Write a protein that binds this DNA or RNA. Structure first.
Ligand SMILES: [Mg+2]
Ligand SMILES: [Mg+2]
Ligand SMILES: [Mg+2]
Ligand code: NA
Length: 343
DNA sequence: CGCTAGTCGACAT
DNA sequence: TCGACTAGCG
């Protein structure tokens, strides 16, 4: 969600991680991976061996461990079919910046070339696994999500397994997270947002419940569904405030009326909205206790799970376990490690 | 004002 | 993995 943090900044508190001393905090590790990969973009683009991002993550991990924090590193897994568009686009951008960067290396211009290399960064599962080994070497629990780390984190937080989530993506709130810590530096200073405190935001109105908030985020334009032309956070929120009807479908079919604008709503956009909603609600996560694949939320009676392939497809529990442990590479689907949490 | 969408940014010498 | 910033539209 573009500009979500600025939109709900009144619900944020400048905190320090000491607040969660002795408690358990889950981490959106790919953020630290993207931050760490920039320091060595040149060598990553050229294919030269590098492991600085590992130590970069380990600074943060050790920082948490020093304050008595019990961290759980969560990593992005398989690509979600309901997100293939964004992945494809970002991939194209990466390739383009890579090519232009190489050409700029041929020109001798190193500044611009580096400026492209830093934008052509691609976080693989191999790097992530380097981080995993490095972390497990110091007794830090690591877990690969079946798909997006967002949903997995949301589950870990809702299940009571973790009490807070360290990330740079505020849109995690739309998944149903209770507490989210943003912009955390290497010392432990960050910005916390509580779900219950969403009432602090005046411009939200009565749109602070999970359902309405989720609707707002989707309508604003997310990674699952592009917003209608001229529709952002404020206007979607306005729609949800002015809307009295619970059935969101008719509301969206009356969005032109609610905003006093001439909006044409394609029939496919409704299906896309249902898809995005069901994706936010029932995206497959991995229960670490029972060791099995479950949706983020228990299925309702108004949904047929067979049509929810875009929210991720089920696999055997053993395979899901081996992926979650990081022993199985996402793309090759072959064993790359043989870790066992039992012995 | 508020949406777009491009730009620029994240590291670290 | 993503947000901050802004010129420009309505
Ligand atoms: Mg990826
Ligand atoms: Mg994510
Ligand atoms: Mg996200
Ligand atoms: Na939008």
């Amino acid at each position: 969600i573009q500009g979500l943090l600025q939109f709900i900044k009144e619900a944020s508190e400048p905190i320090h991680v000491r607040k969660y001393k002795g408690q358990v905090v889950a981490v959106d590790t790919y953020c630290w991976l993207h931050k760490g990969a920039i320091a060595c973009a040149e060598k990553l683009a050229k294919g030269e061996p590098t492991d600085r991002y590992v130590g970069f993550c380990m600074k943060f991990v050790n920082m948490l461990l020093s304050h008595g924090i019990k961290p759980i590193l969560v990593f992005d897994g398989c690509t979600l079919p309901s997100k293939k568009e964004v992945e494809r686009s970002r991939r194209e951008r990466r390739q383009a910046n890579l090519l232009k960067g190489k050409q700029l290396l041929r020109e001798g211009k190193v500044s611009e070339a580096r400026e492209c290399f830093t934008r052509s960064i691609n976080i693989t599962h191999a790097m992530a696994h380097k981080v995993i080994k490095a972390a497990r070497s110091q007794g830090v629990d690591c877990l690969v999500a079946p798909y997006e780390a967002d949903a997995q984190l949301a589950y870990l937080n809702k299940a009571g397994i973790v009490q807070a989530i360290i990330t740079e993506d505020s849109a995690l709130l739309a998944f149903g997270c209770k507490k989210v810590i943003l912009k955390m530096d290497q010392f432990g200073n960050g910005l916390e947002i509580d779900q219950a405190r969403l009432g602090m935001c005046r411009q939200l109105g009565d749109v602070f419940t999970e359902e309405k908030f989720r609707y707002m985020c989707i309508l604003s334009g997310c990674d699952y569904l592009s917003s209608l032309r001229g529709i952002g956070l404020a206007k979607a929120c306005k729609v949800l405030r002015l809307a009295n009807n619970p059935d969101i479908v008719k509301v969206i079919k009356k969005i032109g009326h609610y905003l006093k604008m001439n909006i044409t709503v394609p029939e496919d956009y409704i299906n896309g909205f249902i898809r995005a909603n069901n994706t936010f609600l029932y995206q497959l996560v991995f229960d670490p206790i029972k060791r099995k694949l479950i949706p983020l939320n228990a299925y309702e009676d108004d949904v047929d799970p067979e049509t929810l392939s875009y929210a991720g497809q089920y696999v055997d529990d053993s395979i899901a376990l081996q992926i979650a442990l990081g022993n199985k590479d996402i793309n090759t689907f072959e064993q790359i490690d043989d870790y066992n949490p039992d012995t």
